[PDB]
A paper describes a structure:
For high-fidelity DNA synthesis, Pol ε relies on nucleotide selectivity and its proofreading ability to detect and excise a misincorporated nucleotide. For proofreading and mismatch excision, the 3′ end of the nascent strand must be partially melted from the template strand and guided toward the Pol ε exonuclease domain active site (exo site), which is located almost 40 Å away from the pol site. Our atomic model of human Pol ε cat closely resembles the crystal structure of the S. cerevisiae homolog, with an identical domain organization in the ‘right-hand’-shaped B-family DNA Pol fold consisting of an N-terminal domain (NTD) and the Palm, Exonuclease (Exo), Finger and Thumb domains.
In this configuration, the coordination of DNA at the P domain is more extensive than we observe in structures with matched DNA, with the backbone of the nascent strand held tightly against the positively charged surface of the P domain formed by residues R728, K733 and H735.
Residue numbers in the entry: 27 to 181, 213 to 1175
The structure:
DNA sequence: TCGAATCCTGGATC
DNA sequence: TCCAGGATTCGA
């Protein structure tokens, strides 16, 4: 171990060497300094006693370019419980047993959560242990844990030690929790000298923030035609990097036909950067010149795009050929988890953020689309085939293409990413790297621990999953879940602000509105506005108008009228529900606990109970039969992980094989023994939610809720101040106000994201605070509110669409919608209020409001308040110009969200369900889809809308029948092809056949075994016809064949069809034309014809026929 | 002959 | 990280 420690000291020395190369010279001198706490790492440090001890390492940057590092020693600890009266004796045992291997032992009382008679104020002991090094702590934990395990199986001296807690918190987190240290604040640090620890203090009077230098790059390489490049055999053609707004380019003049002149490029005036070209006589000197320039630049942050698959692996695999090592020059390296990470600068990557937090629709994640959407311009693309040749004949064009991804990457990172990561990281104590890479699961627990810590609460141990949980009746379960909410389209069609439609409204329904109007408007003012009604100058006038309009509604219960459209949305419903009932993961107490809580006395108001729906899924085997098969397994013998190891009795096996062996044998038992093997069961359970557990969780959510609204307020203020800076045009003020605006914008979004995360954690597998019932109560009662709204709205008018958290609906144009009250209050003389909002925000109030909120008055008194609180509110979006909602071809099928809607300005304001296509898609259908939406804006009434549609939709179906011979021949390939690409290598597929596999086979005879010989394949193909009735999987032929030499093309065409005598050989004859007509027929069916028939319009295309079921229904009804 | 139940493999921006 | 889509098997 001493040699291992010496190796760790060598690692330390090497890291100090690199930090010196990057100017992160350690602090040595007594004094105080101020700086920005950019990054931190763990490292172990030798003390003045020459004992190696664990430490953490903090990196700072000044307001100038100077930089420094400081290190803190701090001994980790973990807790063990005890049986009664053991603590002193057990302490003497441990200190005898582990002398020199534990540093200190201590007795501390703590707030348990599960201790009976909890809230009277009792608490239990724990023992704290302290260690010099994490190695020794690990080794002692490995020794200790089995002795607890044996006791839990029962549930010398070690038999008395019962439990242990917080044994697995990452060490570099621990410090930040204990010392309140957090990143991207300003800090002030003083070093007294080695006789003292460093003293470190947070600032909060400084808000202006420094700017780190930022660099990004991209790399362009050779490849061989029709395969992926080889890390060992391909070579580099050009490399380009953008830094602080200046572009640099380098290129391989041994490959490029001519050297490149320095030039300039800008897609939009925002994106300023020009470029400059270095040039070199050989490839190796490219990489040497790169590493020299980056060493001289010594930049702190380094942004790439998808740094896993390609770039760093490539530059590494072509370092060794010339004896280079970036792991010496820059000091980057791979790590056990697979990614690249480095001692002193942090590798950062937009793609993780795009995946995790963009909310862009699926399949738009491809770089060009994401850039276009966020940055608002179209970057241009060349086919990766053509680019390799183009190098030979027009270099300037290739350089002008390749440069673009530098600019796009740099500005994407700066404008969107860089405000977000640090701002969010101001709240949550991890490193800027982990918070970007981590999922939203672990992150929220990494916050929540802070609160649990300062409340002095001992953490629970991880909720490791059980195996084959037995049911209450003794059935073997396989799974459990809460019954979800659902989404469906209630009806389908097209709707517009200006085309007549029909309604029936129940004539008695409006009565239940008109008899409550005044109260409702009172609530609408007093609940939301909080302006006293005594300020209102015209309260009666508007109510009298509304009454008259509701009377006009009652006068004609069924009507022909133009429709409105609105979207009703319960913004952030789930957090509000959690705030509304005092749900806490600790507080869903069982009933048995109320056998002991001294507060459970007659007149107790504190019990509150709610119901949720649970799903079982279980096999039919009875409890005695599982034991009967166990008594068969008791005889059996199994091979261990290596058959060279001794064969194991069932006693010796690990659980993860036992469980599968018994489960499969019980399954094969049932498969014969019972007629059906899985039972699915729904059951309704009633749970009690303890109203008086410690409040810290809800107080956390409340704090975040209110802070978000404060920051949105300040963001609005600063956006106004920015508008004033734009008017004044003073660059200094523009700089200041824009930097404030972006700061608040980022911090506001960050709080939104974390607040949405607060729901998703509590269901996650293995989470520390886990409880199925937290999903149950909140989800079910949430869906229950939607049913109330649906039941209310369907009497007034048809609901079109029913979201997870909202509704789309029509209302009749005559229905009252929006009003202005007038008042004396100079703060707000007149106020606008929307009538559906008032209706919903009163209807929810009567049922949902909570009568049972409680809160503690004085810890020593145990006097408690009673209170009521509510925070569900509906919100109204609309109107919208037009809406389209397609329907699936099948009889009565259910759906998933698919719709579109349009703004009055003609923008496609929202769409959903029209995915960007997984696995690739034909171009023709793509153009058809985007084209047809253009038609719907035109037309007078129902017939004329389709009169517009048909005179565009016909245009393609004519082209396919005609073959449009006038069209240039290459465009058909552009118009019909598929680019489906595959990842395995041919022999990985085995004895199998598929369009891809058959393509892989047929292609090879063009050029040989090379394309099978190495991994992955990419191709383009079309469907052949003449071998009719063999399925399409066999009929595909690769496009490449057309380009081949005429006699070879003849030979293979005469082979691949089994065609004996063919004389005509061109795509016009050979295409399986009408297969693509079927592709068209199966599109145009679902978007147009079915909708048109569903609302009784003539079949809008003679060429296509209704699916037979629809025809038989339509003929029966007419 | 016709309808329902069960077990299986793939998905990642490429 | 499990949902969705097709093929196989059993009942009437
Ligand atoms: S229901 Fe009442 S008595 Fe029972 S644990 Fe909760 S607060 Fe205590």
């Amino acid at each position: 171990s001493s040699v291992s420690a010496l190796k760790r000291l060598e690692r330390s020395q090497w890291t100090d060497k690199m930090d010196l190369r990057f100017g992160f010279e350690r602090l040595k001198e007594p004094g105080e300094k101020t700086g920005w706490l950019i990054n931190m790492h763990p490292t172990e440090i030798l003390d003045e006693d020459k004992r190696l001890g664990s430490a953490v390492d903090y990196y700072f940057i000044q307001d100038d370019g100077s930089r420094f590092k400081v290190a803190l020693p701090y001994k980790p600890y973990f807790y063990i419980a005890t049986r009664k009266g053991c603590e002193r004796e057990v302490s003497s045992f441990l200190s005898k047993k582990f002398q020199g291997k534990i540093a200190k032992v201590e007795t501390v009382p703590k707030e348990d959560l599960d201790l009976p008679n909890h809230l009277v104020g009792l608490k239990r002991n724990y023992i704290r242990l302290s260690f010099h090094t994490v190695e020794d702590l690990v080794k002692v934990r490995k020794e200790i844990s089995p002795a607890v395990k044996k006791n839990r199986e029962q549930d010398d001296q070690l038999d008395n030690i019962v439990d242990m807690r917080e044994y697995d918190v990452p060490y570099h987190i621990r410090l930040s929790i204990d010392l309140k240290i957090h990143v991207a604040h300003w800090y002030n640090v003083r070093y007294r000298g080695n006789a003292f620890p460093v003293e470190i203090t947070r600032r909060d009077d400084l808000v202006e923030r420094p700017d780190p230098v930022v660099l990004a790059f991209d790399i362009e390489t050779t490849k061989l035609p029709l395969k992926f490049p080889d890390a060992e055999t391909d070579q580099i053609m050009m490399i380009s990097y953008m830094i602080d707004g200046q572009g640099y380019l380098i290129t391989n003049r041994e490959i490029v036909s001519e050297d490149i002149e320095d030039f300039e490029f800008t897609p939009k005036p925002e994106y300023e950067g020009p470029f400059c070209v270095f040039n070199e006589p050989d490839e190796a000197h490219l990489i040497q010149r790169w590493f020299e320039h980056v060493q001289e630049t010594k930049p702190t942050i380094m942004v790439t795009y998808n740094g896993d698959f390609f770039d760093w692996p490539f530059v590494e695999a072509r370092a060794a050929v010339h004896g280079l090592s970036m792991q010496q020059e820059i000091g980057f390296q791979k790590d056990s988890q697979g990614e690249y990470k480095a001692p002193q600068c942090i590798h950062m990557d937009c793609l993780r953020w795009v995946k995790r937090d963009s909310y862009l629709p699926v399949g738009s994640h491809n770089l060009k689309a994401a850039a276009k959407a966020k940055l608002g311009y179209d970057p241009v693309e060349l086919d990766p085939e053509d680019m390799c040749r183009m190098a030979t004949e027009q270099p300037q064009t290739l350089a002008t293409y390749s440069v673009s991804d530098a600019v796009a990457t740099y500005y994407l990172y700066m404008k969107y990413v860089h405000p977000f990561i640090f701002a969010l990281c101001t709240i949550i104590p991890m490193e800027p790297d982990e918070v970007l890479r981590k999922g939203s699961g672990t992150l929220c627990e990494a916050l929540l621990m802070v609160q649990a810590f300062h409340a002095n609460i001992i953490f629970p141990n991880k909720q490791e999953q059980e195996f084959n949980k037995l049911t209450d009746d003794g059935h073997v379960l396989d799974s459990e879940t809460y019954v979800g909410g659902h989404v469906e389209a209630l009806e389908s069609g097209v709707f517009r602000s200006d085309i007549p439609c029909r309604f029936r409204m129940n004539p008695a329904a409006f009565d239940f509105l008109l008899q409550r109007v005044e109260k409702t408007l009172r609530h609408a003012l007093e609940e939301e506005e909080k302006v006293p009604v005594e300020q209102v100058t015209n309260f009666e006038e508007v109510c009298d108008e509304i009454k008259s309009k509701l009377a006009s509604l009652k006068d004609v219960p069924s009507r022909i009228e133009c429709p409105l459209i609105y979207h009703l949305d319960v913004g952030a419903m789930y957090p509000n529900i959690i705030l509304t009932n005092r749900l806490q993961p600790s507080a869903m107490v069982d009933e048995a606990t109320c056998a002991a809580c001294d507060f459970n006395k007659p007149g107790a108001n504190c019990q509150r109970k709610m119901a949720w729906q649970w799903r079982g899924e279980f096999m039919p085997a009875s409890r005695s039969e599982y034991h009967r098969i166990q008594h068969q397994l008791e005889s059996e013998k199994f091979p261990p992980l290596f058959p060279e190891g001794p064969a194991r009795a069932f006693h010796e096996l690990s659980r993860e094989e036992q469980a599968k062996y018994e489960k499969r044998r019980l399954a094969d038992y049932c498969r014969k023994a019972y007629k059906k093997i899985h039972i699915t069961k729904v059951e309704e359970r009633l749970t009690t939610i303890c109203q008086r557990e410690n409040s810290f969780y809800v107080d956390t959510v409340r704090a975040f809720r209110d802070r978000r609204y404060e920051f949105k307020g300040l963001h609005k203020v600063w956006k106004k101040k920015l508008s004033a800076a734009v008017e004044v045009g003073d660059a200094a003020e523009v700089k200041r106000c824009k930097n404030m605006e972006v700061l608040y914008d980022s911090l506001q979004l960050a709080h939104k994201c974390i607040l949405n995360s607060f729901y998703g954690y509590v269901m996650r597998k293995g989470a520390r605070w886990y409880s199925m019932e937290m999903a149950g109560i909140v989800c079910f009662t949430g869906a229950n509110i939607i049913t109330q709204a649906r039941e209310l709205i369907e009497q007034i008018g048809r609901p079109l669409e029913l979201d997870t958290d909202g509704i789309w609906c029509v209302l009749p144009n005559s229905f009252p919608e929006n009003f202005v009250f007038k008042t004396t209050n100079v703060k707000k003389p007149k106020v606008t209020i929307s009538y559906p909002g008032a209706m919903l925000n009163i209807m929810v109030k009567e049922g949902f409001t909570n009568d049972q909120y409680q809160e503690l008055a004085e810890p020593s008194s145990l006097t408690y308040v009673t209170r009521s609180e509510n925070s569900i509110f509906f919100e109204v979006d609309g109107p919208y110009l037009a809406m389209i909602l397609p329907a699936s071809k099948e009889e009565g099928k259910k759906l998933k969200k698919r719709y579109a809607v349009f703004n009055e300005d003609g923008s496609l304001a929202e769409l959903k369900g029209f995915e960007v296509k997984r696995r690739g898609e034909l171009q023709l259908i793509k153009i058809f889809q985007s084209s047809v939406f253009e038609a719907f804006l035109k037309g007078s009434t129902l017939e004329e809308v389709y009169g517009s549609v048909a005179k565009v939709a016909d245009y393609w179906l004519d082209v396919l029948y005609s073959k449009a011979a006038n069209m240039p021949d290459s465009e058909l390939f552009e118009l019909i092809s598929e680019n489906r690409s595959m990842s395995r290598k041919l022999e990985d597929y085995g004895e199998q056949k598929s369009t891809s596999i058959s393509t892989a086979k047929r292609l090879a005879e063009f050029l040989g075994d090379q394309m099978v010989k190495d991994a992955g394949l990419s191709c383009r193909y079309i469907i052949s016809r003449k071998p009719e009735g063999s399925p399409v999987t066999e009929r595909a032929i690769p496009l490449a064949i057309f380009q081949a030499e005429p006699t070879v093309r003849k030979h293979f065409l005469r082979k691949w069809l089994k065609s004996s005598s063919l004389q005509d050989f061109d795509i016009r004859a050979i295409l399986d034309w009408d297969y693509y007509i079927e592709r068209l027929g199966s599109a145009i069916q679902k978007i147009i014809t079915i909708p048109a028939a569903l609302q009784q319009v003539k079949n809008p295309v003679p060429r296509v026929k209704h699916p037979d079921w629809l025809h038989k229904k339509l003929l029966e009804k007419n």
